[PDB]
UniProtKB/Swiss-Prot annotation:
It is a multi-pass membrane protein. It is found in: Host endoplasmic reticulum membrane. The lineage of its organism: Viruses, Riboviria, Orthornavirae, Pisuviricota, Pisoniviricetes. Residues 1-167 form the Macro domain. May form homohexamers. Interacts with N protein. It catalyses: Thiol-dependent hydrolysis of ester, thioester, amide, peptide and isopeptide bonds formed by the C-terminal Gly of ubiquitin (a 76-residue protein attached to proteins as an intracellular targeting signal). Changing T31A: In strain: Mu/B.1.621. This is Papain-like protease nsp3. The chain holds residues 1025 to 1191 of 7096 of the full protein.
Amino acid sequence: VNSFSGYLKLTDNVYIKNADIVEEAKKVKPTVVVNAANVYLKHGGGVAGALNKATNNAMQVESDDYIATNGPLKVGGSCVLSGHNLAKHCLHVVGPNVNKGEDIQLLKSAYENFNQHEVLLAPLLSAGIFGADPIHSLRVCVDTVRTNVYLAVFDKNLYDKLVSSFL
Ligand SMILES: O=C(N[C@H]1C=C[C@@H](C(=O)O)C1)c1ncnc2sccc12
């Protein structure tokens, strides 16, 4: 049993809710919250900007030190950093940015990072401002992630469409 509430079960291991991931993280304080990161860990908008803002910019400060030491992530890659006031850990995952010619096939590689964590709170990678179709992102998630994933869909209209088109 875990403390996530009001999710619609989609499969054995995937659950979905219309939720703002920052508000959900603040309420649940999960072990792992997933950030929709870019390779530079520059947290400006969407999930990354919102999480970073909720940490009072501490996420960005930590991230800048990480990049100065390690260099950029790979598209499809990830790193584990602090969850600050929101979660124990933040898994920063880079999905391909469709609007800049990066392969959508890398979305599967991005979701594979989730399998290193038993339970996660995550948004739909590559969707929203990253330019890919959220219906596709949900399908790749379901077909790739085997650990327990609690998906936070920001928009109610989109949430309802994702549920309706699922089977
Ligand atoms: O930006 C987000 N998701 C994108 C992926 C699918 C779209 C959606 O979920 O409506 C948009 C996101 N998701 C969840 N909590 C938050 S809080 C700020 C942004 C955000």
